[PDB]
Design a protein around this ligand. Structure first.
Ligand SMILES: CN1Cc2c([nH]c3c(Cl)ccc(O)c23)C1=O
Ligand SMILES: [Mg+2]
Ligand SMILES: [Zn+2]
Length: 313
């Protein structure tokens, strides 16, 4: 009960900032997640024995892929932690519990391939889940791990609170399907602008939590330029592997995914910042003003990609 996780001074201070990098020491990442749960939720939210067993089973079920790996899971959970801490009174006890777990689990058992590649391959998962293919798999994997003996971190919730938190986690993980982000944000934009946005309306909260999930999932674009630039290499390593597998199916990949067309990456990054990232953090900043630093950091990185294109780096 009286056992707190503490971090070294530099981490204890920087972990509170949106642009925190969790570092190259993998063995510190579980401790960083428990620290965030304890400050975001309470030291009582989870039995520490069960939480530690849950974390380590989640870690084991992430693969050794360049980007969609255990470091991504903890990075996305940290961004959610920073949003929740800067918006203290907007979220319920159940939501703070559910969303940190949702972020840690959101890419469980990812193979480094898009929903599109699974469908063109004719992967069994594409027959089981016709849309949000990987995301329905990630939620399925989450439920499987929660049902391992000694892994049910929610066991002390009432029956209805248990059902509520599993439903928060399901919607949160489905929302990480970028195909669903475009319509979700358009609707949030209209609701904000016509002044109909109402956070006591459950359908409205769902939408806002979905946008938070997109914002945390993309948070690699909100780091200091050296982190953003080095993470983009990991992202493109999966894209080019997927491109290679498209060529093996006799399909020319989009140029972004073709490792023979690396010169076109910086222009591809600009489209992504302008079509996805900037609009995502703009709507997020409008709805939750204290998340402005994510939008500012994203604009700074857009400007760094413009310099890469102009040949200034
Ligand atoms: C963090 N992110 C994810 C992502 C980046 N760039 C992308 C492009 Cl060009 C197309 C489709 C994507 O899902 C992405 C990136 O840096
Ligand atoms: Mg995903
Ligand atoms: Zn992700």
């Amino acid at each position: 009960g009286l056992m707190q996780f503490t971090l070294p001074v530099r981490l204890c201070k920087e972990i509170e900032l949106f642009h925190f990098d969790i570092g190259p020491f993998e063995n510190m990442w579980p401790g960083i997640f428990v620290y965030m749960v304890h400050r975001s939720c309470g030291t009582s939210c989870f039995e520490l024995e069960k939480l530690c067993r849950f974390i380590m089973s989640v870690k084991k079920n992430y693969r050794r892929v360049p980007y969609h790996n255990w470091k991504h899971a903890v990075t996305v959970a940290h961004c959610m932690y920073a949003i929740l801490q800067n918006n203290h009174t907007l979220f319920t006890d159940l939501e703070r519990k559910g969303l940190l777990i949702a972020c840690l689990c959101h890419d469980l058992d990812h193979r480094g391939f898009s929903n599109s590649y699974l469908q063109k391959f004719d992967h069994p998962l594409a027959a089981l889940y016709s849309t949000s293919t990987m995301e329905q798999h990630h939620f399925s994997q989450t439920v499987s791990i929660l049902q391992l003996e000694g892994h049910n971190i929610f066991s002390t919730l009432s029956s209805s609170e248990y059902e509520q938190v599993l439903e928060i986690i399901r919607k949160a993980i489905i929302a990480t399907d970028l195909a669903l982000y475009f319509g979700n944000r358009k609707q949030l934009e209209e609701m904000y602008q016509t002044g109909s946005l109402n956070l006591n309306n459950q359908s409205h909260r769902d939408r806002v939590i979905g946008l938070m999930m997109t914002a945390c999932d993309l948070c690699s674009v909100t780091k200091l330029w050296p982190v953003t630039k080095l993470t983009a290499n990991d992202i493109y390593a999966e894209f080019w592997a997927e491109g290679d597998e498209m060529k093996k199916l006799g399909i020319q990949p989009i140029p972004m995914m073709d490792r023979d067309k690396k010169d076109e990456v910086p222009q591809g990054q600009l489209g992504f910042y302008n079509a996805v990232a900037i609009p995502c953090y703009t709507t997020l900043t409008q709805i939750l003003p204290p998340t402005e630093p994510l939008l500012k950091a994203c604009r700074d990185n857009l400007s760094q990609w413009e310099k890469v294109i102009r040949g200034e780096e």
